[PDB]
Amino acid sequence: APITAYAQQTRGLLGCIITSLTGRDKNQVEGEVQIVSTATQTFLATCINGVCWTVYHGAGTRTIASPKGPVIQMYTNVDQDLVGWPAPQGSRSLTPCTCGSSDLYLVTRHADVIPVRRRGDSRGSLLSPRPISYLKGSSGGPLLCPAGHAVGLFRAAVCTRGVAKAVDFIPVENLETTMRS
């Protein structure tokens, strides 16, 4: 089956803020990618193999709000630009790619899956470029191989004149590495 996805907003501005301070999220969790938010920005956190990874330059060394209060990160790595918490009770996890496909797909914050041709360990070419405003909020999102397995996490956009031609990502390997370090 083809990679399809949808998005559901679970909470608004005020509830988010309260929860940010309160540190206790009582809502139910579903999905492989959580739409994450801080006080400053919003992005994505992908659940790969029991852990909920996101981009460090967004989560920082913050804690994720859970029903049992704040949850301390289980992985932080300023250099690999990664952080990770135990996947929230309810989510479903993706598994890493094992086909070395170079035809990847990026699931965006708007639940749109767009193609990116792998051009190296951390780059890929948007077969059909998009403006950066579109890609905003998609950091920490997944890069799936044709089989739907995690190849990487969207990190930055390779843009010029406000239009993203390519994308820079974090290979699943750096997660595994970050895990053992």
Partner: peptide, 22 residues
């Protein structure tokens, strides 16, 4: 430093379905 809060979700596990009527 506030906690990161989940404000939404993206679901990939959904497979085509015939939107039910209510």
């Amino acid at each position: 430093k506030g906690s990161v809060v989940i404000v939404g979700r993206i679901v990939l596990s959904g497979k085509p379905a015939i939107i039910p009527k209510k």
